[PDB]
Design an enzyme around this catalytic site. Structure first.
Site, PDB file in Angstrom:
ATOM      1  N   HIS A 132       0.415  -1.184  -0.206  1.00  0.00           N
ATOM      2  CA  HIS A 132      -0.186   0.348  -0.289  1.00  0.00           C
ATOM      3  C   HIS A 132       1.198   0.945  -0.450  1.00  0.00           C
ATOM      4  CE1 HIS A 132      -0.159  -0.290   4.761  1.00  0.00           C
ATOM      5  NE2 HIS A 132       0.090   1.063   4.553  1.00  0.00           N
TER       6      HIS A 132
ATOM      7  N   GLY B 246       2.360   6.462   9.311  1.00  0.00           N
ATOM      8  CA  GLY B 246       3.974   6.275   9.214  1.00  0.00           C
ATOM      9  C   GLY B 246       4.674   5.416   9.534  1.00  0.00           C
TER      10      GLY B 246
ATOM     11  N   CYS C  87       3.567   2.018   9.105  1.00  0.00           N
ATOM     12  CA  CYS C  87       3.599   0.456   8.761  1.00  0.00           C
ATOM     13  C   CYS C  87       5.146   0.246   8.262  1.00  0.00           C
ATOM     14  CB  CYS C  87       2.754   0.877   7.204  1.00  0.00           C
ATOM     15  SG  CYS C  87       1.115   0.974   7.800  1.00  0.00           S
TER      16      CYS C  87
HETATM   17  O1  LIG Z   1      -3.668   1.671   8.897  1.00  0.00           O
HETATM   18  C1  LIG Z   1      -3.152   2.634   8.362  1.00  0.00           C
HETATM   19  C2  LIG Z   1      -3.403   2.783   6.968  1.00  0.00           C
HETATM   20  C3  LIG Z   1      -4.571   2.052   5.913  1.00  0.00           C
HETATM   21  C4  LIG Z   1      -5.135   1.929   5.528  1.00  0.00           C
HETATM   22  C5  LIG Z   1      -6.339   1.489   5.302  1.00  0.00           C
HETATM   23  C6  LIG Z   1      -5.461   0.037   4.684  1.00  0.00           C
HETATM   24  C7  LIG Z   1      -4.248  -0.341   5.058  1.00  0.00           C
HETATM   25 CL1  LIG Z   1      -3.221  -1.572   4.658  1.00  0.00          CL
HETATM   26  C8  LIG Z   1      -3.390   0.846   5.597  1.00  0.00           C
HETATM   27  N1  LIG Z   1      -1.995   3.266   9.196  1.00  0.00           N
HETATM   28  C9  LIG Z   1      -1.997   3.431  10.132  1.00  0.00           C
HETATM   29  C10 LIG Z   1      -1.038   1.844  10.656  1.00  0.00           C
HETATM   30  N2  LIG Z   1      -1.409   1.303  11.911  1.00  0.00           N
HETATM   31  C11 LIG Z   1      -1.469   2.797  12.712  1.00  0.00           C
HETATM   32  C12 LIG Z   1      -2.488   3.928  12.383  1.00  0.00           C
HETATM   33  C13 LIG Z   1      -2.101   3.843  10.711  1.00  0.00           C
HETATM   34  C14 LIG Z   1      -2.582   5.783  10.569  1.00  0.00           C
HETATM   35  C15 LIG Z   1      -3.493   5.848  11.286  1.00  0.00           C
HETATM   36  C16 LIG Z   1      -2.985   6.227  12.851  1.00  0.00           C
HETATM   37  N3  LIG Z   1      -2.661   4.761  13.633  1.00  0.00           N
END
Ligand SMILES: O=C(Cc1cccc(Cl)c1)Nc1cncc2c1CCCN2
Ligand SMILES: O=C(Cc1cccc(Cl)c1)Nc1cncc2c1CCCN2
Lengths: 304, 304
Positions: free
Chosen positions: A41, A143, A145
């Site tokens: 992604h 960030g 990821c």
């Molecule tokens: O979840 C995501 C973006 C995302 C959206 C939809 C699908 C996928 Cl694969 C990835 N990133 C993230 C990871 N861990 C934690 C937090 C975030 C962002 C928000 C704050 N915390």
């Protein structure tokens, strides 16, 4: 003595962390040999995440669109491929800090350390477990990821997790290093709800053994039970069923303390039924389940 | 989202760990520049520990009696000196992996990461706090002495603790890197009992703010209190008195959540008086006090 939620020393993994940017998205990558692994992604915009067709999005990307930075130096991308939900970016330089490593897919209940990173830089390390519903209860911000989970056996790093997403419930989902998600999760911004987060019984028992080894013995009772009787109680309290494989795995802890596994099960049964009564076990007011029997032996023996 | 007991990445400190042996005693040393720091009780036998005269014991030791090994290579000791409860072994080689570093003496309530080591090899990393009674609740076995506690600010490692001993109560005592013990402890195998282990109020409040930031809000009530009223309750529950300095330090967390510090104090007052009622906060059934306000901001902002 003393018992702590301990993570593996992170140095070997810190030497592998890089920043990967594609378009406006920046996340972490894992640089091992001449390949940088990262969540696929990275090619998506926030809009693309609602319904991404990764194969179609990837067609519009070339090697020069993947910016890989290791410290303050840029790595040259000479190839790219998608393997399940991860991208493999071939670079022209082998990571000089590549440790001995393996890619393993862990089972629920197994623990690992996470090196949380942002912009390819490590921020912290913590210990967690793969939950029986295939989520992890991490500490990840935007960030994060591409941050990875791993175990170390002497000098070999076994990478088991790569962070991909946060579910609407605040729990985390990701893949092994072959890009296959743990559980039924998909890399899409859609309604994904986790199943029942049950307690890892064998780990609670291991931690009860760690408590006895460290002197906390108030919860030891005069009772015993059978696997079937214990499991009736464990079902009622959303605990995983205990099998003879689990009893076998607790054998060394049972031998060290002289407390038969089924006697410890009877202590756990009374703790579930009566509660803690305002008391603590190893400084905890709840039953801890993120220590495997291997973790308890490792911590209590001093494996480096 | 998610909130974990997170330690600093340990790589910078792993590159400093060495094994120090003197006679039959082996423990860990910290190699920074051309000096190896280690607990002075490395010169003692188990018998010597009952009533050691370190100056007299040290007279019988020469540079060649201190065996220092960094990985599988031996370092040449060209000098030795005792500074308070630590020995400084001058070696002929500067540690090529020496990070930017400082030696700091922390105050009670402050947190740090510990890299537990045995035979100069890292076994694990965990986060802890200097207790108000100047003990630490660590996870240390025999041979762990000389393991260090530290904080990292970008690329600067601030070493704050060196492990020396385990009290008869299973709690831990040690020194700063100048060899001065935290608290009234001495490096002798004698009756040393710790004082009251009170709860670090300002840290509990920071962690309550972290819970609100992460969505756990059930404990927020319709009340407020004053510093003096709150402190009457905190005295009753063996909590440290909260000062205006502490309120000031919680300012950013108060601003982020829009919850005035004294309102959070009133929530904490009701939690102390009524208990949790079988409920949890950030996956804990007790009030966590090993996160400082700086730790909460750092974790919730993603400082690398
Ligand atoms: O979840 C995501 C973006 C995302 C959206 C939809 C699908 C996928 Cl694969 C990835 N990133 C993230 C990871 N861990 C934690 C937090 C975030 C962002 C928000 C704050 N915390
Ligand atoms: O406490 C000692 C030895 C010692 C005795 C008296 C004074 C001093 Cl400075 C040091 N070492 C130790 C440290 N941490 C943990 C465990 C040990 C040994 C027993 C197991 N755990």
């Amino acid at each position: 003595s003393g018992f702590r939620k301990m993570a593996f020393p992170s140095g070997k993994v810190e030497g592998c962390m890089v920043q990967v940017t594609c378009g406006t998205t920046t996340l972490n990558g894992l640089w091992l040999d001449d390949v940088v692994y990262c969540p696929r992604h990275v090619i998506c915009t926030s809009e693309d995440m609602l319904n991404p067709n990764y194969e179609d999005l990837l067609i519009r990307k070339s090697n020069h669109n993947f910016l890989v930075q290791a410290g303050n130096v840029q790595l040259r991308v000479i190839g790219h491929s998608m393997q399940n939900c991860v991208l493999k970016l071939k670079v022209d330089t082998a990571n000089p800090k590549t440790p001995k490593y393996k890619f393993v897919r862990i089972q629920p209940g197994q623990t690992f350390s996470v090196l949380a990173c942002y912009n390819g830089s490590p921020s912290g390390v913590y210990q967690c477990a793969m939950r029986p519903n295939f989520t992890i209860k991490g500490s990840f911000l935007n960030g994060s990821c591409g941050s990875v989970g791993f175990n170390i056996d002497y000098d070999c790093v076994s990478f088991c997790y790569m962070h991909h997403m946060e579910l609407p419930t605040g729990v985390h989902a990701g893949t092994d290093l072959e890009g296959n998600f743990y559980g039924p999760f998909v890399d899409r911004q859609t309604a994904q709800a986790a199943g029942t987060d049950t307690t890892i019984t064998v780990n609670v028992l291991a931690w009860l053994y760690a408590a006895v080894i460290n002197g906390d013995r108030w919860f030891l009772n005069r009772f015993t039970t059978t696997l079937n009787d214990f499991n009736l109680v464990a079902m009622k309290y959303n605990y995983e069923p205990l099998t003879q494989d689990h009893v076998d795995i607790l054998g060394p802890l049972s031998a060290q303390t002289g407390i038969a596994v089924l006697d410890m099960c009877a202590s756990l049964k009374e703790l579930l039924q009566n509660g803690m009564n305002g008391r603590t076990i190893l400084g905890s007011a709840l039953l801890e389940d993120e220590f495997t029997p291997f973790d308890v032996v490792r911590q209590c023996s001093g494996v480096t």
